[PDB]
Amino acid sequence: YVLGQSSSMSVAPGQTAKISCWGYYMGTKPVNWYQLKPGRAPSLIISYDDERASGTPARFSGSHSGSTATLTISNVVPADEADYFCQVWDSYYEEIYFGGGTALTVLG
Amino acid sequence: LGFLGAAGSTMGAASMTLTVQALTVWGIKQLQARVLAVERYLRDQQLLGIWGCSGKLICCTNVPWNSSWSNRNLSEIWDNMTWLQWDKEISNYTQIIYGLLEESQNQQEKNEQDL
Amino acid sequence: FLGAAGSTMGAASMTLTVQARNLLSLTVWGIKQLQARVLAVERYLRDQQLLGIWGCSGKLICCTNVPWNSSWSNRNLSEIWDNMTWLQWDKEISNYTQIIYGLLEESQNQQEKNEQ
Amino acid sequence: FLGAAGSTMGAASMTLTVQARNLLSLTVWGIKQLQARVLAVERYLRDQQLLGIWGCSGKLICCTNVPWNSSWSNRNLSEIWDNMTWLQWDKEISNYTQIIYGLLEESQNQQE
Amino acid sequence: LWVTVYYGVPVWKDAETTLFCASDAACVPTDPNPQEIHLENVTEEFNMWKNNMVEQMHTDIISLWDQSLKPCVKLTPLCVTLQCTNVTNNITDDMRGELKNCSFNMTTELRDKKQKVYSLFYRLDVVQIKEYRLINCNTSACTQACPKVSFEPIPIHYCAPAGFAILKCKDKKFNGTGPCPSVSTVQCTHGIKPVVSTQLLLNGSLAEEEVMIRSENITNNAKNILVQFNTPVQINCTRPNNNTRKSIRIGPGQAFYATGDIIGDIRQAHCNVSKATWNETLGKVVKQLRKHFGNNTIIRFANSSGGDLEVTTHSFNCGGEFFYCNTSGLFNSTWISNDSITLPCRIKQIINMWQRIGQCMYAPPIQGVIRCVSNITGLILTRDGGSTNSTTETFRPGGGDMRDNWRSELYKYKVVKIEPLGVAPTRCKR
Amino acid sequence: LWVTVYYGVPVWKDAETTLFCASDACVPTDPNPQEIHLENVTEEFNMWKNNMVEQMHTDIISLWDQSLKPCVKLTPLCVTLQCTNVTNNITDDMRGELKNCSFNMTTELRDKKQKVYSLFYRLDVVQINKEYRLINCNTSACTQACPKVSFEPIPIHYCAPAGFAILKCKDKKFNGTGPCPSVSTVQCTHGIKPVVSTQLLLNGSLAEEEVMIRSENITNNAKNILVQFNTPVQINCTRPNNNTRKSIRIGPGQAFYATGDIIGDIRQAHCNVSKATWNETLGKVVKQLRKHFGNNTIIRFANSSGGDLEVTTHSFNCGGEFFYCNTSGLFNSTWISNNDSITLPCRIKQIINMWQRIGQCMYAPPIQGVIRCVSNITGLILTRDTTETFRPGGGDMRDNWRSELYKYKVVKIEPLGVAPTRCKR
Amino acid sequence: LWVTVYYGVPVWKDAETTLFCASDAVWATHACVPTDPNPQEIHLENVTEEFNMWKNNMVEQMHTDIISLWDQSLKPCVKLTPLCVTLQCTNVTNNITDDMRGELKNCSFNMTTELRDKKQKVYSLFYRLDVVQINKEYRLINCNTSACTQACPKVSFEPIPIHYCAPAGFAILKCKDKKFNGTGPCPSVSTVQCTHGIKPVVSTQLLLNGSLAEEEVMIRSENITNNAKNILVQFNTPVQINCTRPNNNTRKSIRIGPGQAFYATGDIIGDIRQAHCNVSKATWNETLGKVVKQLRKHFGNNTIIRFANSSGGDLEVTTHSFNCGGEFFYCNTSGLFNSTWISNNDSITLPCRIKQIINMWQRIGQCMYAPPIQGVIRCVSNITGLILTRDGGSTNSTTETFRPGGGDMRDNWRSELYKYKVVKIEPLGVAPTRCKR
Amino acid sequence: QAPLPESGPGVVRPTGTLSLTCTAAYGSISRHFWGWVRQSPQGTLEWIAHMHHLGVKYVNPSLKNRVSISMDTSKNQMSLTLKTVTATDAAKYHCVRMGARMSDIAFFSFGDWGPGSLVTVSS
Numbered sequence A: 001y002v003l004g005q006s007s008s009m010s011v012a013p014g015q016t017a018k019i020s021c022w023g024y025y026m027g028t029k030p031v032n033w034y035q036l037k038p039g040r041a042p043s044l045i046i047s048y049d050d051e052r053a054s055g056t057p058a059r060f061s062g063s064h065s066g067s068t069a070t071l072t073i074s075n076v077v078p079a080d081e082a083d084y085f086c087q088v089w090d091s092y093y094e095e096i097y098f099g100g101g102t103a104l105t106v107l108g
Numbered sequence B: 001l002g003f004l005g006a007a008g009s010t011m012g013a014a015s016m017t018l019t020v021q022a023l024t025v026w027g028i029k030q031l032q033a034r035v036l037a038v039e040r041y042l043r044d045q046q047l048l049g050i051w052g053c054s055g056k057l058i059c060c061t062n063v064p065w066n067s068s069w070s071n072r073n074l075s076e077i078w079d080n081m082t083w084l085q086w087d088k089e090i091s092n093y094t095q096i097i098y099g100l101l102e103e104s105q106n107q108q109e110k111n112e113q114d115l
Numbered sequence C: 001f002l003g004a005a006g007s008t009m010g011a012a013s014m015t016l017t018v019q020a021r022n023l024l025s026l027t028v029w030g031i032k033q034l035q036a037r038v039l040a041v042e043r044y045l046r047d048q049q050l051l052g053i054w055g056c057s058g059k060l061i062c063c064t065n066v067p068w069n070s071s072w073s074n075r076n077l078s079e080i081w082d083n084m085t086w087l088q089w090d091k092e093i094s095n096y097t098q099i100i101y102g103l104l105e106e107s108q109n110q111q112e113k114n115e116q
Numbered sequence D: 001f002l003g004a005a006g007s008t009m010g011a012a013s014m015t016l017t018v019q020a021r022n023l024l025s026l027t028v029w030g031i032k033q034l035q036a037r038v039l040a041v042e043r044y045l046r047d048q049q050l051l052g053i054w055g056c057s058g059k060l061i062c063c064t065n066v067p068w069n070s071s072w073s074n075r076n077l078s079e080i081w082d083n084m085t086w087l088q089w090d091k092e093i094s095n096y097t098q099i100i101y102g103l104l105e106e107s108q109n110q111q112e
Numbered sequence E: 001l002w003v004t005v006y007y008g009v010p011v012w013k014d015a016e017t018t019l020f021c022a023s024d025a026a027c028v029p030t031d032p033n034p035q036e037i038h039l040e041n042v043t044e045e046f047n048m049w050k051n052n053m054v055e056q057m058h059t060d061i062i063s064l065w066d067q068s069l070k071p072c073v074k075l076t077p078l079c080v081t082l083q084c085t086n087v088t089n090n091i092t093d094d095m096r097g098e099l100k101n102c103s104f105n106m107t108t109e110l111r112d113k114k115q116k117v118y119s120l121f122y123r124l125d126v127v128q129i130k131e132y133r134l135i136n137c138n139t140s141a142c143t144q145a146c147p148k149v150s151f152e153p154i155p156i157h158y159c160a161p162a163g164f165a166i167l168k169c170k171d172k173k174f175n176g177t178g179p180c181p182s183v184s185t186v187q188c189t190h191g192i193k194p195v196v197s198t199q200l201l202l203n204g205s206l207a208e209e210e211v212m213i214r215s216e217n218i219t220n221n222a223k224n225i226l227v228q229f230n231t232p233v234q235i236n237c238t239r240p241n242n243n244t245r246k247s248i249r250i251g252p253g254q255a256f257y258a259t260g261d262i263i264g265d266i267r268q269a270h271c272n273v274s275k276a277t278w279n280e281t282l283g284k285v286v287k288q289l290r291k292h293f294g295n296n297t298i299i300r301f302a303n304s305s306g307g308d309l310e311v312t313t314h315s316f317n318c319g320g321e322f323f324y325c326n327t328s329g330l331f332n333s334t335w336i337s338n339d340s341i342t343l344p345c346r347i348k349q350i351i352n353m354w355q356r357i358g359q360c361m362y363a364p365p366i367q368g369v370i371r372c373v374s375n376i377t378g379l380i381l382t383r384d385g386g387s388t389n390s391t392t393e394t395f396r397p398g399g400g401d402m403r404d405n406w407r408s409e410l411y412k413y414k415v416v417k418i419e420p421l422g423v424a425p426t427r428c429k430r
Numbered sequence F: 001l002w003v004t005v006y007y008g009v010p011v012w013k014d015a016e017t018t019l020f021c022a023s024d025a026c027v028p029t030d031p032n033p034q035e036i037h038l039e040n041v042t043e044e045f046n047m048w049k050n051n052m053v054e055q056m057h058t059d060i061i062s063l064w065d066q067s068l069k070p071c072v073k074l075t076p077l078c079v080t081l082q083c084t085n086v087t088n089n090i091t092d093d094m095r096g097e098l099k100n101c102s103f104n105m106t107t108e109l110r111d112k113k114q115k116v117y118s119l120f121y122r123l124d125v126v127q128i129n130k131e132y133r134l135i136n137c138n139t140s141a142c143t144q145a146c147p148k149v150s151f152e153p154i155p156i157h158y159c160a161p162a163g164f165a166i167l168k169c170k171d172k173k174f175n176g177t178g179p180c181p182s183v184s185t186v187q188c189t190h191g192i193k194p195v196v197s198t199q200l201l202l203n204g205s206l207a208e209e210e211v212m213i214r215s216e217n218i219t220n221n222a223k224n225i226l227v228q229f230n231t232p233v234q235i236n237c238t239r240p241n242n243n244t245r246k247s248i249r250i251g252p253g254q255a256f257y258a259t260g261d262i263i264g265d266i267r268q269a270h271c272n273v274s275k276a277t278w279n280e281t282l283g284k285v286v287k288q289l290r291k292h293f294g295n296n297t298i299i300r301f302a303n304s305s306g307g308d309l310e311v312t313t314h315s316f317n318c319g320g321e322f323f324y325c326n327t328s329g330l331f332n333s334t335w336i337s338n339n340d341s342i343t344l345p346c347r348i349k350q351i352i353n354m355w356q357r358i359g360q361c362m363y364a365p366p367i368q369g370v371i372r373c374v375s376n377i378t379g380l381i382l383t384r385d386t387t388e389t390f391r392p393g394g395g396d397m398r399d400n401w402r403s404e405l406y407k408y409k410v411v412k413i414e415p416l417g418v419a420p421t422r423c424k425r
Numbered sequence G: 001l002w003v004t005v006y007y008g009v010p011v012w013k014d015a016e017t018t019l020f021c022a023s024d025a026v027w028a029t030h031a032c033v034p035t036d037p038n039p040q041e042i043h044l045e046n047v048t049e050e051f052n053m054w055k056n057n058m059v060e061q062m063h064t065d066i067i068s069l070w071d072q073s074l075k076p077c078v079k080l081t082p083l084c085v086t087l088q089c090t091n092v093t094n095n096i097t098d099d100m101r102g103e104l105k106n107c108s109f110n111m112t113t114e115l116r117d118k119k120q121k122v123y124s125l126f127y128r129l130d131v132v133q134i135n136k137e138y139r140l141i142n143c144n145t146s147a148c149t150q151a152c153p154k155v156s157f158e159p160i161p162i163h164y165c166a167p168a169g170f171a172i173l174k175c176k177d178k179k180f181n182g183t184g185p186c187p188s189v190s191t192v193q194c195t196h197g198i199k200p201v202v203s204t205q206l207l208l209n210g211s212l213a214e215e216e217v218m219i220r221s222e223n224i225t226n227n228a229k230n231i232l233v234q235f236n237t238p239v240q241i242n243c244t245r246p247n248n249n250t251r252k253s254i255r256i257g258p259g260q261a262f263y264a265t266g267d268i269i270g271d272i273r274q275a276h277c278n279v280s281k282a283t284w285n286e287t288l289g290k291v292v293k294q295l296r297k298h299f300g301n302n303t304i305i306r307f308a309n310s311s312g313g314d315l316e317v318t319t320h321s322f323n324c325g326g327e328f329f330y331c332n333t334s335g336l337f338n339s340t341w342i343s344n345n346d347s348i349t350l351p352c353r354i355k356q357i358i359n360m361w362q363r364i365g366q367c368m369y370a371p372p373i374q375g376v377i378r379c380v381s382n383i384t385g386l387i388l389t390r391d392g393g394s395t396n397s398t399t400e401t402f403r404p405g406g407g408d409m410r411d412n413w414r415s416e417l418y419k420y421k422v423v424k425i426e427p428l429g430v431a432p433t434r435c436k437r
Numbered sequence H: 001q002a003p004l005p006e007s008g009p010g011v012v013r014p015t016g017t018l019s020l021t022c023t024a025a026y027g028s029i030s031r032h033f034w035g036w037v038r039q040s041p042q043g044t045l046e047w048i049a050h051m052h053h054l055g056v057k058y059v060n061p062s063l064k065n066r067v068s069i070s071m072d073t074s075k076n077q078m079s080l081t082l083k084t085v086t087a088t089d090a091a092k093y094h095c096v097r098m099g100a101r102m103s104d105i106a107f108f109s110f111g112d113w114g115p116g117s118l119v120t121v122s123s
């Protein structure tokens, strides 16, 4: 199983990018948001649906409502261009569910 | 017992594996021993029941965490702190918390259940 | 401890927790004060078992399906909650207590158990 | 006390409280007496621990989610409730109950 | 069908627990009445030969006997050289030499003074080294009984703690081992009397409608046979030896009671049974003994084999003195498929009961003529166990360990342990 | 309206239990016996059926017994003593009160004996018929009080076990019985000194308002009267008989401390009280007695009637020596309708049969040098027989401890309670 | 954030409790719960606990328990009150070997019989250490402080192993660090229910039948620079010691009262030869070299380590005192500690004297009489440690000398209960978590 | 306690066995949960398994039949064994340290990812 995720998308600098994660087997489980840039290992940026990891700027934020989770990036700079993923833990099925990944690209 | 194996594990790692399935003179000795064991077991069980967590090994309560008890973080005390360290840093604050747990959410909730 | 003995029956129903903690803590002297500890433990366990039979389990302020028989003091709830302490209630209910215990034991618990 | 030893299990299930109530009560004599008292208390507590492990600490009759495996007894619900006493059940179920308590622990700790 | 848990279930298992006193008013008074509940339709296996009550009662009775002797005088000074002569008073011919008149020296209240005293000692207590010494000086110094404490057997009841029950077999024809159709549960036992006797059970409990015969193995000659009588056979035991006890101050607050002068003549202490009653009782015994031993056997009753006086004689306690009677006139008969029997008795003062060595008690003399009437309600017999070539088997009075005395009382009682956890299938679910 | 169950209800009834002592066979105390004052309470006390006293009696008896277990048993002292008078500055008073007795005694070697001598008080020797013997040899030989253990009464605090509570009354005018408007719940009793005395209660507590008279049934003359003082009366007791204590080895590891030679003159031990203070306190007592016997009765204080020396005299312990003082100068007065000192001559005894028990005495070893003690008379024990005569009383020692455990009682708590409420399950 | 309550949290504190018996079955080993089939030991991974061998309460409780057991066993036994008589003694110069001259004495005396008016003139052989003149008139050394209780011949002094188990709610922390001095942090800990078997061996200068160190000799002390604190040396290879009493003595039985028998010493069948212990010289010096090497670490590799004998005091502190099969030996350990190491077959024979009146545990007023053991006694044991003392400071010197020391008998059990400590568990814990209701 | 670069064979033949070893650095490996995540060449992350040294292990049921995971605390390492390798298994395997909180809701978070070992399935 793979969680649904927003289609790969592009923003103009200074705008806000929203990445959505959803699925039937998602429910209220907290979502962790991960970043992936070329030349690096993936890093936690968001935990427990709203907790900013160390080094995560105040621009990044999280929310969870229903079976939908939203990673909101405000005042986007070209440094944010990367592949972004959502992850949850299903205790009933005892499985990690990762997102399909959304490629956030920057115009201009 | 012998569950102490997670003593060095961080609290977040402890908590979890902590849901896995769980003549006339020495006669005074191994009678005070067992009486004390029974008294302590009953005291912990009664204290839990007073807090409203009678059967639950992990029990969330309605007593907000005061901003003068830890004030450290929530991602490091579960990933960079052990339970022994936590008890060392929290000790002599546990009595106030026990009082808050006992007064609130059970004495202030059982009465409101039928009011 | 015991600070609400002279207070109203209801105001004293806000401190049941402080009177519950105090309920449990030469060879001749040790034996004398061992049976005190064993007696306290067994008395607390008997009270808890009595509550558990009555469906009180671990609660302090329960609610029972037994209805209040009118032949018990004939007073109103205002008098039995606002101008009377637990002590005169205890002295007024006296005798009429084993009947209460039986009604709690069988009329509610066993009847509901066989009902389910 | 114990009056329903010969009665059927269905007819002995309404007299559980009487049995449950009697489970709780120079110097050398006091040692033996106090030891017996403490032992009785320990049995009551260590068997209430079992009851609370299966999630019914406050109850006298517990109904669980464990399926009744046919490998034990394999008989009708009428013969074993209207044509037998509990003492007849103890001999038949003996040397199985040590696994039943398992599959009574799990099906509560893990399922819920 | 799902597992359903029941607490309070009425099932039990054999156990070996500890029971407590119920001494009616280190023992607690009883309730107004030890109510019993008859269990209908229940069959329980009884075996009185593996009963733990008969062992705990032994240890309890030994311990209470020891406790009553703690605050009493220890006759250490009594271990001295006694110069004894014969009584040569107005004696009969059967009391020639049984009593001795001994003069000796005892410590006074004041440590620097010694008093010359005399006492009358039975022959069984003195051993010659005209110079004698008490028979115990080789082994221990005897503890004299406090003159106030009595040797009466007072009723005691054994009550099981919480979580245990006592099952009583009400079956009349119960032979001590096997199923018992009629079972009751009692809070605790009826008044049981710790009567210390050998070869003859005294003032005990009678059977109903027949004389009962019990044994761990009726074919094994090494196991004592217990006979329980339908009707009592009354013994009259007397000591026609009007006595005088004198107190001798043997220390600062310690008194030793010694036999003074027997005023009048001196005669054998003796017990009497009725000839007719004893013959009828032995007829019942032989009739019920044939049922186990073939209808064509010849039954012989003979006296004991030999050994210590505590086993070869009917030993008991009559009004505070310790009698050892010669039971040869009772067990002397052969049986083929208003008179009185007089049993001669000797009296001892230095006694070491329960086969224990190194702890002895000295029974003070009791003033005046002592009379006692009591019921024989059983025997402890032992078969000779010879060869099958003969069709005649002989039975001799026993008198082994004292547990046989208390078996004959706690034979209908067993202790059980309540297991209140029961699992049964029921629909319900969740 | 339906029944509702409450656990932790604050109710109690009178109880009987075993309390435990909390010293400063005993356990350490708490920093403070926190008294929670119970407002709007009115509870009935009875100082005369209090089992807190019957328990303290057995507690002190057992503590005394276990303090004598390891000590030397003076069995060899029960010998024939050859005694003579003690001359040489004997004084007109205290003539024949001391005897010089020689006797043979056992040594550390079982085959050797030593001729030793000692001074015995006349009250401890009886003639045998010059030749004497100790008075206890007829009844029982007895232990010797070890010099290491002191007789000074250490305070003991009685504490309620789990599930029980101790209620202390704070009323200033308690009669000992009846209602008490002001009650508190105290975890452990205050420091109660087990002072053993007769007639005059020493080192006790004071009434804080006025002289208090406590009786069971004050119209029953058989019962005794306990009088409590608002102001203490100082009593100075002394034994001006400087004397040596010699050690006689009576066996392997056993030493008997005898009396040697008294250095100086022989003078009688005595207790001094102030005449003015005693008269004032007796006036207060008479005034309070008039409240119960009417304001027109003649109050006459006469001395004790008869009995043993342990009941006819004020008996106490002054620095290890057991005094028996003749208090016939204190209780000698008559009140109809409205410096200087009183000297009470005392006698010292060495064989002590405490607590009226027979068969167990104790030998108090002599204390070297002059003995002096000062103490407070804070109560009396009186017995009554148109004029009412009161005499000093010497009843059982419980009365000594009643005057201290008179504002305390033990109660048993009931958690369970059922009350009607508008709720259903 | 909200409070969450966890039951089963792994937290302990230092605490003192009453650990109980554990044996592996005529001493008090029957009234002691028997051991489990196999010990349940768990390894606390990555935990560093603070131990202190010198403030341990297990040592004190073991001390009190052993005194209580010893006193309990010497209760139903004969009390030799009559033995306090005047003894007429002569010398025993028959097969004397030039070295046990004067040490034995032949004493005749009158004692009570079973009859109170008769006395018997009996004789017994007593060692010189147990008699004192009263000015050829002698008395037992104890008959001016206390009367001795005769040890019952049925009981055995052979030390049975005992395990100490913590009660429910408590745990014992074993320190498995090979290089653990005994104070401070131990970065390898396990939790055990019961300790391993600890033999209650009583010895003064040389620790016997103990537990060996691993891979090196260990020096332990409360304060190394304090000369008043003893130094505990734990060996890694045992040094075998063979102790014998060559005398073939015969045991008499004197009836001294009703049911009371006193076991005297009869005539010696053979020659009178001193009791002695033998230690292999080569092994002793190869072990003392290791001790010197380890001791140089706490004092510098230039100082010279000297070994000298006991300074002074009573016989139970200036001699290696032990109990070899019922007989109480006091051996002169002067040939062991006599050496000087600066910077870089054969046997040693320690003479031993034998005592019968024993005031064990430095208690005054309580003595015990050991009945003779018939026949030749020979026992082989392991020296597994030493208890040394450093004298004064001898400031500004290159010389440090060490003398054997006895001290208390607790030091005999500090060497076994050094790797253990007792802790109390708190299941309960409160933590901040995101929850509600 | 971050991970050092993983150890891997570089290439594994089909039907072969893949062995990967991750060595924890800057701390103990018994402090937390540790896991393995394979990143596909496309860019998808598939969680494989993870565990805590005391014995509790979570393995992806889709690869339960052929995943073996273990730790060695003496050498401070973990090992993954993948039996019967197929072409789809070719990926970059990251060794990740994790966190875990557990209240009423169970929780995991992949804290510090390793550089990863590339595994190509070829003969």
Ligand SMILES: *[C@@H]1O[C@H](CO)[C@@H](O[C@@H]2O[C@H](CO)[C@@H](O[C@@H]3O[C@H](CO)[C@@H](O)[C@H](O[C@H]4O[C@H](CO)[C@@H](O)[C@H](O)[C@@H]4O[C@H]4O[C@H](CO)[C@@H](O)[C@H](O)[C@@H]4O)[C@@H]3O)[C@H](O)[C@H]2NC(C)=O)[C@H](O)[C@H]1NC(C)=O
Binding pocket: G154, G155, G156, G158, G159, G201, G208, G209, G322, G323, G324, G325, G326, G374, G375, G378, G379, G380, G381, G382
């Ligand atoms: C260090 O440890 C070593 C080994 O663990 C100890 O050496 C052991 O020492 C003991 C005690 O001396 C010894 O046990 C005796 O061995 C004798 C020879 O093998 C036995 O004959 C003897 O049995 C008698 O004593 C028992 C205990 O009282 C009795 O139960 C038994 O029935 C025997 O008693 C009868 O027989 C004797 C025979 O003479 C007779 O005199 C008696 O009256 C009675 O009739 C013990 O078993 C071990 O054998 C030694 N072990 C070894 C390997 O040599 C050493 O003592 C320890 N050191 C210290 C300081 O504790």
Ligand SMILES: *[C@@H]1O[C@H](CO)[C@@H](O[C@@H]2O[C@H](CO)[C@@H](O)[C@H](O)[C@H]2NC(C)=O)[C@H](O)[C@H]1NC(C)=O
Binding pocket: E127, E138, E139
């Ligand atoms: C104490 O003395 C008595 C009297 O001699 C002993 O009893 C005798 O023991 C011998 C030894 O076998 C027997 O032959 C005699 O028949 C016994 N006589 C009696 C009257 O019993 C007794 O054994 C001695 N106790 C001891 C030595 O412990």
Ligand SMILES: *[C@@H]1O[C@H](CO)[C@@H](O)[C@H](O)[C@H]1NC(C)=O
Binding pocket: B066, B067, B068, B069
């Ligand atoms: C929590 O308690 C601290 C005292 O340690 C106090 O300073 C703070 O104000 C409290 N906060 C709340 C919200 O009660």
Ligand SMILES: *[C@@H]1O[C@H](CO)[C@@H](O)[C@H](O)[C@H]1NC(C)=O
Binding pocket: F083, F084, F085, F095, F096, F130
């Ligand atoms: C002095 O001693 C004699 C003889 O012992 C005695 O009679 C006399 O009473 C004694 N003196 C006094 C004052 O008692």
Ligand SMILES: *[C@@H]1O[C@H](CO)[C@@H](O)[C@H](O)[C@H]1NC(C)=O
Binding pocket: F126, F138, F139
């Ligand atoms: C002992 O003798 C005295 C008189 O000498 C007497 O008063 C006392 O009662 C006697 N004790 C007894 C007989 O117990």
Ligand SMILES: *[C@@H]1O[C@H](CO)[C@@H](O)[C@H](O)[C@H]1NC(C)=O
Binding pocket: F175, F176, F177, F178, F179, F214, F215, F216, F217, F218
């Ligand atoms: C004591 O005073 C009370 C009033 O509180 C009264 O009831 C009682 O009778 C009095 N008793 C005596 C002996 O004076």
Ligand SMILES: *[C@@H]1O[C@H](CO)[C@@H](O)[C@H](O)[C@H]1NC(C)=O
Binding pocket: F294, F295
């Ligand atoms: C008796 O006299 C006293 C004097 O103090 C007085 O208080 C009291 O009222 C009087 N009682 C009467 C007159 O009845």
Ligand SMILES: *[C@@H]1O[C@H](CO)[C@@H](O)[C@H](O)[C@H]1NC(C)=O
Binding pocket: G091, G093, G101, G102
């Ligand atoms: C006995 O030994 C002592 C001490 O060794 C000695 O002084 C004495 O002379 C010896 N006597 C004989 C007779 O050998």
